[PDB]
RNA sequence: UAUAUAAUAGAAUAAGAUAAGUUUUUUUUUUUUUUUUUUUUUUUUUUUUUU
């Protein structure tokens, strides 16, 4: 019902943690709960930074991805930017990230570029995975990639931005999408050959 | 097995009439002219005294 009423989540979300029930909840739960709450714009922060922080190393160590993208999605529609969560969250991608999903992959880019994530060499990785499936992304996945925010960044090398270059063009339909996409290949490490060759066909 | 992301800049320079909001001696000095009073000098007239 979009029902903004925030001083009675406050609430719920205050007994959540009083009672130390937010350690033994189930992974999907949390993943539906934040997620939930990340769709009325909350406002009282600090609360739900204090139930993100009760959740111990023994959880993050197993988790499913698909909860995993919908807590890390709820936590960037959030506008959180917690240090000691993000390393859990990074070093758990390393053991399954090749189940992700083309979706999972696309939404996962830009929830991490979203709230200032640093660690180059794991979205580097992620940017490999997206260029391997290249040939499995539709429209969609397209948008939530190539309109995160500062993409330029991670267009680095060659062989894991080619792959993927081909499909937008070939895929996507919106002009504004198109000139997003070529304005923002002025501003990487791209060859001028490639990049001129890439705006040819994108610009329109 | 998902319904959705959005941020780039430049300049140095002036006109000009609206029927409006106090008042608190008047006096001192210098020069010229006229009138009145006092003093001094000269001339004329009258009276008294002396030679």
New binding site residues.
Partial sequence: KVFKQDRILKQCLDYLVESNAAVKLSATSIGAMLNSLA?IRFTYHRSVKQFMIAISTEQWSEM???PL??IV?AM??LSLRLPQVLVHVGDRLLDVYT???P??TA?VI?SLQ?IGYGNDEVLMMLMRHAASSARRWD??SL??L?????VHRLLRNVEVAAPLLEQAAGKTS?P??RQ?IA?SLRRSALPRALVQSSTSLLTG
Wanted: hydrophobic share 45%.
């Fill in positions: 769709a499913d991805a698909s993208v919908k999605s960037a529609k189940f992700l999903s979706l999972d939404l830009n979203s429209e969609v948008t939530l190539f309109g995160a925010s500062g919106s504004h999408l997003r304005a």
